[PDB]
Design a protein around this nucleic acid. Sequence first.
DNA 1: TAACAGTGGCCTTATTAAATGACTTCTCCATGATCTAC
Lengths: 285, 289, 288, 150, 109, 109, 109
Amino acid sequence: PNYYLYGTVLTRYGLASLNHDIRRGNKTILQKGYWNNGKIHSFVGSSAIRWALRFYLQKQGYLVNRVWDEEEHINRLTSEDFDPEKFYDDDIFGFALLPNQRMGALGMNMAVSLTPYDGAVKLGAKSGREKDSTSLHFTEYHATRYQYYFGIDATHLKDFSRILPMIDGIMNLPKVGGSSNIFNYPFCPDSLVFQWTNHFASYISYCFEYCDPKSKEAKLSQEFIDEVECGQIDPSKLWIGGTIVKDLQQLDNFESSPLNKAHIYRNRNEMIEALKTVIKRDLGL
Amino acid sequence: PNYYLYGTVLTRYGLASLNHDIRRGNKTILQKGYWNNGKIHSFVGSSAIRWALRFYLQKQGYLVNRVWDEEEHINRLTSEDFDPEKFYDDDIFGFALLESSTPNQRMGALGMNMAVSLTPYDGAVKLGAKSGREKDSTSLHFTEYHATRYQYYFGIDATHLKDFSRILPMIDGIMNLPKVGGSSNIFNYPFCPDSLVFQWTNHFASYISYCFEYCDPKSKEAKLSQEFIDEVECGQIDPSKLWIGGTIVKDLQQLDNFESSPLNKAHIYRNRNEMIEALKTVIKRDLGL
Amino acid sequence: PNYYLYGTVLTRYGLASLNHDIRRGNKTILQKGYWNNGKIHSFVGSSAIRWALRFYLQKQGYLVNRVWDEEEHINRLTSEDFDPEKFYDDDIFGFALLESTPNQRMGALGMNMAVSLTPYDGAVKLGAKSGREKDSTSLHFTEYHATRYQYYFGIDATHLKDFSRILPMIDGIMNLPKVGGSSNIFNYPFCPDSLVFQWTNHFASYISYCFEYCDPKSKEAKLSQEFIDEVECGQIDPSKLWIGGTIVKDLQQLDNFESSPLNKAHIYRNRNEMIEALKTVIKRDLGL
Amino acid sequence: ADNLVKGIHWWSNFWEKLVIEDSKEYLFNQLFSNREGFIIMAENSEEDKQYLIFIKVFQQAMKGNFAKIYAKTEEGKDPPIKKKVERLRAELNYCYDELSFKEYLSDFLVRGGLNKYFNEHQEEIALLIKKSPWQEIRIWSLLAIASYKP
Amino acid sequence: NSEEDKQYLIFIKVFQQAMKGNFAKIYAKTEEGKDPPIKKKVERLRAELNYCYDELSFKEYLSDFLVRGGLNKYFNEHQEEIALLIKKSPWQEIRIWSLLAIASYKPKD
Amino acid sequence: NSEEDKQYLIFIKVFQQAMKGNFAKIYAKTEEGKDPPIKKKVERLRAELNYCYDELSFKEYLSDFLVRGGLNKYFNEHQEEIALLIKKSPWQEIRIWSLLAIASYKPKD
Amino acid sequence: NSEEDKQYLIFIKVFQQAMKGNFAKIYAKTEEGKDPPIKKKVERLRAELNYCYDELSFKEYLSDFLVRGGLNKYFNEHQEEIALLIKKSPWQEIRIWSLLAIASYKPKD
DNA sequence: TAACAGTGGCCTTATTAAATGACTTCTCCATGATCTAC
């Protein structure tokens, strides 16, 4: 049976400069665009998160075709012929020769800042005296939480057991490409909405929303909550975990709401363990 | 009788790059063109949605002539001669054998129009670059994306189907559409409906094509158009043949004087599954399944 | 194994004018921006703290490629080719030689900008060149801020060329020299007064900014309720949590502290004892 | 010849017939061979000298843009005119509506440095850029690229 | 010439006068050396104009630059027209006009 | 035309009157043979305008500037309109309007 | 509409009335052929308003100012809600509103 | 009541601007010699 794991994760609050766009002149341009309300929102590309997952797989065994050298800052291919049956990297993220080309068992969308980006520019100077063209520069940061949506086709994996390391990596994401030296931003999630269903219809994409411009309270939603109440998104297939649980359980009439009978855990590790148990049972691992 | 299922379906809000065309040098251009009031919108081809429906029929286990190999990325025909009586895809989407007893072509029961972005295309682009200091001609590149909802219009000639019962899998596929051809690795855009306006009538005329509008040029609002509401008010569209489901139901119910409007007596369901179940019951009763 | 030392350090209360912005007119402004609740907080750049750490490494002997002259205010490179094996600063902070052994290094230290615990409301200090003569460079204004500062850092210990170089880095974080700013008129010691360190072997931290204020115009500081909930719910293994500083008294004054899972963490009122225990654990884990 | 027969401008459909319908720069390469014919046709134009002024402005801007990188790149590392012209043509082809094309053209003109031809014809060229359809400006930019003398 | 074209040309002249003032201020500031750069100033202006990402930021930068220009006689003569043009027009079009003014600028001999 | 445009234009007039009053006050302040300011006072006004953060500081400074301007007829006729305009509206937009008024105040003096 | 600005406007009105009453009291204070200043009264009021340092200061100051305002009718039918408005809201916002009222006071006299 | 409203120096250094392959498939002919039926 076809099984898909859709999820939207919310990162912790902090100052982020992850995805510089093009360096317009003196400024490192944080990647941004219009979103939701017609306001400019900073973005983190999905390729950055895929690179972070690749690095997580490489750092802990998990034979991978592409090996990040981490010293020469180059990628080396163990086998020039991609073999999804042996390497986790080829099996999960796919490839393209330009063959087989795979298709990619993990589909991910760009991470979107939960808050509009106002100006958030940081000045940078190089010590003192003998000033040159590189002495003065500016960098664009952003003090918000990032939110991205991913989808996994579990049946598409060459080895079904490889979905568990991917979940572990998503919950233990390494440095997502960015200015870690100056703006160290952990990309581990503090709020999760996972759906382990068996049809290609997900209504949890970018569920988290708070606007309230400059803040970090990060309420869940009203459209997603209405979707749960109306009858679809059955709570048995819904997994909610993280700091959003505290706000969810404080809502009025929560006990009588259909959202109550969803798998809701305040501890992320407990929900991950329960979800992995369900996944292993369903996939015959 | 001759029954048709017309429908306009609106997708969820997200970042989409599903409609690339011939690339201009470095940057990957997504298909776009002029639309309402002269602004440029991004279009998703209807062949993409037809391919997604075909893939849904194949995955669900229905007998399909053209089998798509996921591992090989090739298309294989189980029977070289198209047989609409036996194969779902030939019956629904038709065929046309053009090469130098059985008919060589079929008109196809399903008729679909292009998917149009609800919001005009602003011009957003995203830079991609291969990691590593060893950089070559294929190091950095640009991909255009659009943060919008896509709406598309489809029509089904139920009587044209060789087997009348095949309309139900098509509705299920429309409500459970697989990935619509695009860049799923970096722009995973779910194409499942979140707002429907269906019409199950024996009259050939349809006034529901592209009935959704935006409240603000750059916003995720997706309100029902004033022309469609006016045509419901004037009595042109029979409310008993109207099926509205999805998130637009809330906005409709918050409208002033909704209880006195003829739009009230239409089949309105917040839950899309309930609307689909009721519509399928009506369709089965009408077609005698 | 891949061991990481995350940590959030809270400074002492005092008048601060550390990191400034573009010159503008006669008034030197702080680096400020919206942080929480839509209020404007003052920031201290992480490059300033990195410079202070480099200066600490230089002062206490050690081998640093960059040598701050301290007399002509110039930077001299002992070797034009960066050698992370030999020099402490190249090993820790990395390098990037772009003008045209690898020419670039990612560095083992990752810092974030220090955020004032208190919103910045007013606090502009009038400054005069004095005398009776007056000129353009006579009347000037300098912004200050009476607040504590709090920043978050992470160390990839395995990324270090020499695994033992983490210990001088912890010592420098403890005895940090002056962080770049107008120390002549606003002397602000950046030595920590409260610490929340985590020595774990996975990438998730959940301890980014654990300190929050009470009575937004006061010097009092407390651990954020989100952090306490994170500790109590089961996440954040207490055995990997090192808490030390003046926040220890407030933590121990909490009700049901003994029954709380937070009691099982390594809690030391004296910062030196906490640092010694943490360094013992680090030396045991890294095989030093 | 077809444009002359139809009674329209001789450059009426140059873009969609010379760049869009070009497979492997087969049609594009012939522009630099017909550069002399382009120059003759522009010089002996029956009317519309303002767009020849625009040709001069765009050629000066192209000279500045190319010279920037050619000074950045030393001998041996200097790429031929072919690669830069191909990149410029691709960037021109990227533009899809009036706003994007005019933004790109204006940024290109600014990056071209000081432009004496633009300065001597401020009002005329400014009005021409603001008012004329962007497709015509793109076509004339293409044929100014074709008749560009290094 | 239509009224829109007249206001567009007046805005071009206003921006050119503002650049004259800013470059004169720079020249006075860096009189030292063989000669203050001119191409570098234009590149700085282009980069700063391209940095703007939304209407508010671009209009803030444009107003700041115009004020830094100085007297700007063409703005003296056309308060209401130019003010309404800046307030109303989309920021992308105003940026296009500003860059056209930059390109069509003649440094004083 | 349009109410918002009229309010914006007459707010520009209000700000220009306020700057006239402040500059007259500066003129009265200086004495003897020292040259009274003309342009560097405008630069000081610009620097004070950009030295602004959050809604509170800028509105405080704007109100203080308007009061220091003294008598002004444009604010006299329109109390409710300008009071609402200043109290409402983002402070950055009002700063943009103030800078636009600065750049076009000079035809008066 | 949205009676918050209604409260803002009638606060401005009663502030203008109170300052008119205080200026009348000052007119009573002065004597002889000396011209009673009007602009200097506004300057003194602004300086005293800027003299405060939050909460206690400027709250008792402005309450005392309104009390010396005299028989203010709009105050009389708007005692309770204006008192509630003063008790709530940040004091700097009240100062901004007061300064705007001063800047828009004259056409009464 | 007064006098000032910053004095400096920089405004990015590199690097790479795409890598493939496809560029319609069928059919509908016109006309006269001859066969053939009336």
